[PDB]
């Protein structure tokens, strides 16, 4: 909890409070669709409709299963979707804080656009476009 804020170096505690509700939106939606008889094609199709969005959202990086919706959906999966967290992974940066300061004084170019927002969210598929200056 507190150290998760410390490890991810989040600007605000309410930002953690946002994504728990955003996880809470998915989680009760994960509940109510699961509270159906197994013979329903409405049930079987629409679980897959929800999953196939969340792959390209980058929350489900690997290919996942039905029960992993209760499991793999965390706030930290959303916390990894932040811009400098993605920036540290592909190893053009050097530390966590180095990824911060380059967004601060503006050395990161995602595709054709200049971005200096620290709360920028990165998907699974748009990540090939981060360029230098």
């Amino acid at each position: 909890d507190t150290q998760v804020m410390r490890t991810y170096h989040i600007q605000n505690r309410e930002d953690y409070h946002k994504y728990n509700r955003i996880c809470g939106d998915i989680r009760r939606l994960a509940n109510k669709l699961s509270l159906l008889p197994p013979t329903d094609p409405f049930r079987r199709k629409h679980e897959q409709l929800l999953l196939d969005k969340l792959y390209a959202m980058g929350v489900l990086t690997t290919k996942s299963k039905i029960s992993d919706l209760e499991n793999k959906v965390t706030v930290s999966a959303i916390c990894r979707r932040r811009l400098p967290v993605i920036m540290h992974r592909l190893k053009m940066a050097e530390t966590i804080q180095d990824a911060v300061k380059f967004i601060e004084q503006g050395h990161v170019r995602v595709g054709p656009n200049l971005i200096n927002d620290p709360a920028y969210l990165v998907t699974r598929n748009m990540e090939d476009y981060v360029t230098w200056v």
Partner: peptide, 26 residues
């Protein structure tokens, strides 16, 4: 009943579709 539960989830579904698409432009 079963038709009623379809209306309950889909309204929650469409807003949840709407909220994640906001974050896709973020």
């Amino acid at each position: 009943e079963l038709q009623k539960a379809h209306s309950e989830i889909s309204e929650l579904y469409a807003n949840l579709v709407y909220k994640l698409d906001v974050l896709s432009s973020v």
